[PDB]
């Protein structure tokens with residue numbers, strides 16, 4: 001392992017990936033739950049760069065996460081087309097990011113699953129009365145603070161735009177320490193700026 005500074009734990013709102021101009025295909029298991037799903041757990045550097053594809057000889061061995069697959073199909077689905085079981089996506093994230101995490105394959109996926117549950121984004125938002133509905137009905141501030149109170153750290157929100165031209169919450173970034181033990185304050189955040197003061201939290 002070459003070591004890194006921290007992890008970006010990236011989750012996304014499925015609805016916002018499927019209501020755009022691009023193509024989204026439901027998993028082989030069917031339409032995903034109306035809940036935040038995992039995009040990936042990424043080893044990163046504090047200088048804005050990151051290591052990737054650290055072991056191009058370490059393919060994903062499904063046997064090691066066999067019993068986690070049914071959960072992953074629901075909490076870490078692939079929305080790309082054509083419809084798939086998600087293995088390609090998981091293989092991709094493992095090879096590109098997992099091999100650089102210093103974590104064993106099962107530990108890597110379990111960590112992602114554990115942090116998705118711990119972050120409890122959907123419920124933290126409900127607690128603040130922020131629920132899915134059409135239109136830019138919510139202030140970005142209310143969303144960030146609601147997650148912050150429930151996680152204890154401020155998230156970074158990435159927004160994209162739906163066919164109607166509404167700016168919507170697309171992905172949520174939180175930071176995890178390099179030992180994958182707990183959430184930490186992000187040393188740095190990405191530099192996007194697609195989130196207006198008012199955004200949409202699209203229903204499924």
Ligand SMILES: O=c1ccn([C@@H]2O[C@H](CO)[C@@H](O)[C@H]2OP(=O)(O)O)c(=O)[nH]1
Nearest residue numbers: 008039040042044050052092093096097
């Ligand atoms: O800190 C970062 C920022 C981006 N990425 C990858 O590039 C795509 C940018 O939209 C992101 O979707 C993401 O795609 P992927 O790695 O999942 O395959 C990184 O690897 N590290």
